[PDB]
Symmetry: D2
């Protein structure tokens, strides 16, 4: 039938561009589905921050895997998962790929940042040599099914400029990476060059409050981008909404003022497809 | 042991989660308890200055994309509880439904919630032992069955850990029958009582004086029950007020809105005013304290 | 798609876990299924050349230090199943007790076992809906209740995935009542049938021909039931023979012995002859293939 | 009352020496308890191998934590847990300590091996500089309760000889490590020197089939050792027993020959304390 990795490859192809929305949990995935998104995303920083932790590589394969499993249990919508640098050496990478496949994950992204750091080493954005990242990619490709999508993420644009970035990316593709992930380029007219040089489908990361700008989906597609990621958008809005409710309750002693801002029970039941549970019991049993 | 108040070394007893909950219930008037579906939410609640937090059973299920039909088990709720208590020492109350099975399952639930550093649980008098194809229902077990559940829990619990008996009987059997069950639950060893928000706030003094132990009023939305202020409920002898799903419902509407924006406009520009700032995020995560810790302990 | 047999490209269909189990049941006469409590045991079983493996419900509980009293839930067994299927593609049959709850819990159990790459489950006709303080018992549910459980499972299962209906009725209701239940279970959509080892091997031809679907005989130790050889059981129309706890019981006696040795002699010298060699361990773990993989893919 | 870490400190003191047995799972812990051991151990290699994985640092905090939780749920006997090199930098170490405490673990051991290695780096026994390990220890000590025991394991004897090993160990103690873990020394008369130099309670690792020898508990105690670890002893015997049963069933078509080698149902019920469950239901209910 349709394998997760296939569904992702297909979505990447038939969408122009493919919009991929972050969802921090299964219910958010169901909202995204209901709105008609074709692919969803589990953000690494999202996993950490939702646990109340900074995005400093404290989390491991199990933290991400559990959140991924929760999502894929609720939806068949193809899921892309941030695996950071792969959580360790060759065999850990291999374990990550195999477990993500077992969890019905469609795609992962893995990046060219350094991991191997002294105990007390400060938060940084340092790149590994091209060869080290090649090794990472080989480790993953060795175990992956054909369908399953490995996205190589480079963080080198910010540090090494467009040319060095195209050079890394191309080497990553020949090491077996299926697709490429780069931050949103500083100039949308850098994109046609970047995309035609790497040939494989390219992902532009539309973060908020970062160094990088926002462009529209149409705009990015017209400049040769095939995937556009919104890694934390919903999450940031959820947090503002929650904080507002808490502040309301604390200040007013009741949640009256917040009621207009709440999803209705009726809408919640519809997203959960509650009726289909009732109908299932009527369809199968009696009494 | 002793802690300094300024320069003065005075007695101070370190408190266990369950003690911190008992103390919060005492020093607050009334104690407001807010639902948080995850650790980040718990930190927001902490930041606003709530003294207790809550892990909703329906919240656990719905967040997994499941209806609140008793599908989830000890492990589902325990994992979400562990995630929260890892991030905060703020006393956490956890919904354990009917206890997930018979006497030894209840015992396991109590013990594991204690090990997860949970302060309190609530367990309710709904029927569990339903035929395979039984339709969703609000049936109560007889008072004796619930007594047995409470005995199972009390048998294993530490002294400090709080067991809250929840009755769902008000809606179906009225005030008197509800007071009767609750009183029996207290004598079976329930530390506190949990009931829906009564339809008439002037039924509360009667209810509270009859059961004597601290009473929780459940401030749900979009249900049958009304809303009152915390002050109002405290004036009628209520000692805890729970907001089980409030934040979650708002989070869902906000997420949906962002999704709809991105889908319709092909960019999230319109959504930016409605997003928490990265700076606020960093502050709630206490990011700076991580940087300072590395400077405090190491070189370079 | 096509696979080479030597130089010749021929048709070959990749098989799903549940297919591999169906195929094993077909090409083996009979299929021996061995219990393994963990992934290492599963690899030992594989190394000896078993074609299927088993995750025992009582094994899951007892390994956690718990009696087999229905305390454990979907998550306990699922985690142990996941650990095994991570290590081996050998088709795994998993005990799901009564399904851990009503219709949607059963459905969840089936779906999660499929996602964990499990080939088959067994689900049984024991009572689940017991009062809080109910004593350990071997009560059966009526045939209709079990039919409902099976319908719940079949509703969600893939075609290949195997649902085995286990009856515990032989011991309490005799051969006829047992055949009656089993036949009803097959028509409710059970793929295969699981019964205790019959007290008389000459009751098997009757039992097997009446239920038509592949039958499993449970070769327990220290129970009421006898032992027969695999050949013997196959000659009487049995297609699966299960050894649910055999290895585990031996492992426990061995562990205890080592502990006793160390305690009594202050060193493990006497135990060394009874230990697997490090070299054997390395071979079962296929350690060399890790070294070769690094040489195959990288430099230095 | 009695905190796990306290119970471990106390056992280390009042036993001469303290024998610590590996138990791979809760049932094994209960056997060890029944035999009268005072402390138990969760081996890192045991965790990996039981998962069907080589001891190559593929496992993470979650793998070990889950197995630890399972054991501590069943027994209050103080548990020492192998945390390898701590599964990452400063904050991962801190997470490991805090989670082990929450799991009711009494002690951990952390070692001075290198972790930070290229993707395809081969299995090795290379040491980090003394300073790197100091950093690791500081990270752990920063978060640990007073009671909870941090054991610094050095693997330097084999590579750097006795003197360099004493030098590392002493620095580890002053970095805040509560106790020291070394392989079994090649000569039991190296021990008095080693133990008096480091002052803190010392652990000798009694592995089988290794480079290092076996000595008796009495022998090691007389040479100034306060803990003796049997990391895999029971596990190796369990594996031989299991394999024999499998071979029996496969060859003979029945498990008859293996029955003499099985724990009886009666003994199993006693270890599980089954009777106390029956008595509890009679003590609390009726009918
Ligand atoms: Cl003073
Ligand atoms: Cl050919």
């Amino acid at each position: 039938s349709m394998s997760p990795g296939k569904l992702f490859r297909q979505a990447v192809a038939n969408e122009h561009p493919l919009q991929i929305v972050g969802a921090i949990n299964a219910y958010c995935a169901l909202l995204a589905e209901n709105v008609g998104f074709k692919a969803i995303y589990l953000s690494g920083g999202g996993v950490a921050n939702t646990l109340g932790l900074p995005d400093l590589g404290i989390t491991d394969l199990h933290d991400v895997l559990e959140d991924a499993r929760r999502i894929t249990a609720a939806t068949h919508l193809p899921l892309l998962v941030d695996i950071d640098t792969g959580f360790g050496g060759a065999f850990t990478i291999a374990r990550a790929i195999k477990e993500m496949e077992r969890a019905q994950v469609a795609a992962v992204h893995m990046e060219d940042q350094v991991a191997q750091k002294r105990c007390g080493h400060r938060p940084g954005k340092e790149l590994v040599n091209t060869n080290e990242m090649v090794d990472r990619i080989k480790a993953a490709v060795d175990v992956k099914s054909n369908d399953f999508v490995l996205i190589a993420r480079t963080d080198a644009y910010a540090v090494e400029g467009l040319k060095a970035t195209i050079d890394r990316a191309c080497t990553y593709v020949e090491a077996g990476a299926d697709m490429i992930f780069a931050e949103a380029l500083e100039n949308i007219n850098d994109y046609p060059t970047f995309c035609k040089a790497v040939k494989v489908p390219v992902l532009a990361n539309m973060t908020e409050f970062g160094k990088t700008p926002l462009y529209t989906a149409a705009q990015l597609a017209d400049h040769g981008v095939k995937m556009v990621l919104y890694p934390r958008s919903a999450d940031r809005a959820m947090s503002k909404a929650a904080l507002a409710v808490y502040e309301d309750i604390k200040k007013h002693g009741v949640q009256t003022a917040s009621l207009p801002f709440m999803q209705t029970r009726e809408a919640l039941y519809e997203v959960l497809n509650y009726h289909a549970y009732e109908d299932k019991l009527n369809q199968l049993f009696k009494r």
